[PDB]
Structure formats: C-alpha cells, structure tokens
Amino acid sequence: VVGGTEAQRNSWPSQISLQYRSGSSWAHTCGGTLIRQNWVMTAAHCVDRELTFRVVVGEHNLNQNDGTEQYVGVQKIVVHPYWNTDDVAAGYDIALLRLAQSVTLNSYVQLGVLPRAGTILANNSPCYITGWGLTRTNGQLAQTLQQAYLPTVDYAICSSSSYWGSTVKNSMVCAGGDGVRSGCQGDSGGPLHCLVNGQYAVHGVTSFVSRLGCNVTRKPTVFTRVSAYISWINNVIASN
Ligand SMILES: *S(=O)(=O)C(C)(C)C(=O)NCc1cn(Cc2ccc(Br)cc2)nn1
Numbered sequence: 102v103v104g105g106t107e108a109q110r111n112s113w114p115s116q117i118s119l120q121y122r123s124g125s126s127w128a129h130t131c132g133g134t135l136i137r138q139n140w141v142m143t144a145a146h147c148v149d150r151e152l153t154f155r156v157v158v159g160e161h162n163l164n165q166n167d168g169t170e171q172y173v174g175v176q177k178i179v180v181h182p183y184w185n186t187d188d189v190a191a192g193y194d195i196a197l198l199r200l201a202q203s204v205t206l207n208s209y210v211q212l213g214v215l216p217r218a219g220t221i222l223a224n225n226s227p228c229y230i231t232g233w234g235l236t237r238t239n240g241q242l243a244q245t246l247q248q249a250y251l252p253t254v255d256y257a258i259c260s261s262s263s264y265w266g267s268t269v270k271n272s273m274v275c276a277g278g279d280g281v282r283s284g285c286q287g288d289s290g291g292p293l294h295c296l297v298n299g300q301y302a303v304h305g306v307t308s309f310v311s312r313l314g315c316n317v318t319r320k321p322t323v324f325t326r327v328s329a330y331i332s333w334i335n336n337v338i339a340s341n
C-alpha cells in the first residue's frame with residue numbers, strides 16, 4: 102500500500118498473509134481474506150507458481166510474533182476455471198484455498214463479510230485497501246499492516262480511454278487513482294473493504310496495478326469484483 106497509514110492491530114481481522122516457503126523460512130507474496138474457518142479467498146495469480154504455501158491469520162507485524170497469529174497449511178487450491186494467467190485483463194482473478202485445519206476465531210481472526218451477489222457500488226464509494234505490499238513503487242514490503250482510503254471509480258470512468266480503457270471489465274472494481282494512494286506489489290489477493298449500510302464488506306480482491314507504477318493518476322488499483330463470484334464461491338465451498 103502506497104500512501105497508507107499503519108492499521109490498528111487486527112481492525113481488519115479477516116486479512117490474511119499468504120506466504121511461500123523460501124529456504125528454511127517464509128516469504129509474504131499476497132494478501133487474502135478469511136471467508137470460512139477453513140477457507141481463504143485470494144487472487145488466482147497469487148498461486149500461478151507451484152510452491153508450498155501457508156496462510157497466517159491474526160497477523161500484524163510480519164517480522165515479529167505478537168501472540169495473535171495462527172499459521173496453517175494450504176490443503177487444496179481451487180482457481181476459477183476461466184482464469185488465464187496470460188490474460189489478467191480478462192478477469193476471473195480469484196481462487197479459494199482450503200486450509201489444512203480450521204483456524205480459531207477471536208478478536209484478531211474473523212470471517213470477512215461478502216457483499217450480496219450483483220452489488221455494484223456507486224462512483225466514489227468509501228473503501229479501504231489493506232495489505233503488507235510495497236509502500237512505494239519499486240520499494241519494499243510493509244513490516245506492519247497498512248491501510249489506505251481508496252474510493253471507488255465506477256466502470257464507466259475506469260474503462261474509459263483516459264483510465265484503463267478496455268482492460269477493465271465490469272467484473273472488476275476500480276479504486277483510487279489519485280496519484281498518491283494505491284495498492285502495490287504484494288497487496289494482490291487481499292481485500293478492498295467498502296462501507297455499505299454501516300458494515301464493511303470485502304468487495305474486491307486486489308488484482309493488478311499499472312506497470313508504470315503503483316500510485317499513478319488515472320490508473321486506479323484494479324480488483325476482482327467479489328459480488329460477481331458469490332455463486333461460484335458458494336459452489337466451491339459446498340462441493341469441497
Ligand atoms: S498485485 O496487484 O499486488 C500484483 C502487482 C499483481 C502482485 O504483486 N501480485 C503478487 C504476485 C504473486 N505471484 C505468484 C508468485 C510469483 C513468483 C513467486 Br517467487 C512467488 C509467487 N505473482 N504475483
């Protein structure tokens with residue numbers, strides 16, 4: 102997250118860190134959202150490489166154990182069957198990870214609330230991105246979870262020629278693009294939390310940023326639109 106601030110400890114208790122084994126240790130690669138005690142929602146592109154993954158729930162400071170974390174293996178990966186790693190812009194950038202055990206819920210570990218199927222937010226709706234992704238273009242990961250206010254940019258604007266044009270689809274949510282605040286590498290897979298009827302719900306899964314930079318005017322961060330996938334998510338959970 103570029104242009105963010107440090108989140109209060111576990112104010113985003115459904116945020117997870119998706120990590121892969123790197124030698125004798127672990128490396129953060131993506132965010133995700135805990136949606137059942139044994140299921141995480143992330144981006145399909147986060148699992149394009151065949152690696153050993155783990156999920157950390159209750160995380161805040163990646164470099165230090167604070168007593169709130171639970172670490173769990175990934176037992177099954179279900180990528181959307183229409184995902185094409187060579188065509189991010191086609192969409193379908195979503196995957197579900199079945200965890201090797203069910204995590205315990207507490208003040209630090211909670212299920213993320215999903216929107217009702219089909220929900221489209223009005224332009225400029227209030228949302229926050231969260232993650233441990235880079236804090237500047239070409240920079241380094243955040244040690245502690247960051248948040249940034251990233252209001253939505255509706256499809257008509259986001260898919261116009263001076264923004265992302267045809268690359269953005271109606272199955273995506275765009276947010277930000279002010280040139281100061283944005284998602285960045287390693288926020289991918291994580292949530293966009295948007296306030297609806299007084300409750301935050303996870304409307305986006307971070308999918309891509311501009312190759313020109315993370316915080317780039319009229320290149321808002323692009324998210325898979327969770328509300329387009331409610332039936333798919335429920336079908337996967339019900340059949341696994
Ligand atoms: S996201 O918008 O943050 C973005 C820029 C697409 C991103 O940084 N995604 C992170 C990501 C994770 N993976 C899979 C992967 C690739 C290589 C290794 Br060594 C490990 C994991 N690809 N992009």
Ligand code: NA
Nearest residue numbers: 162165166167
């Ligand atoms: Na920690």
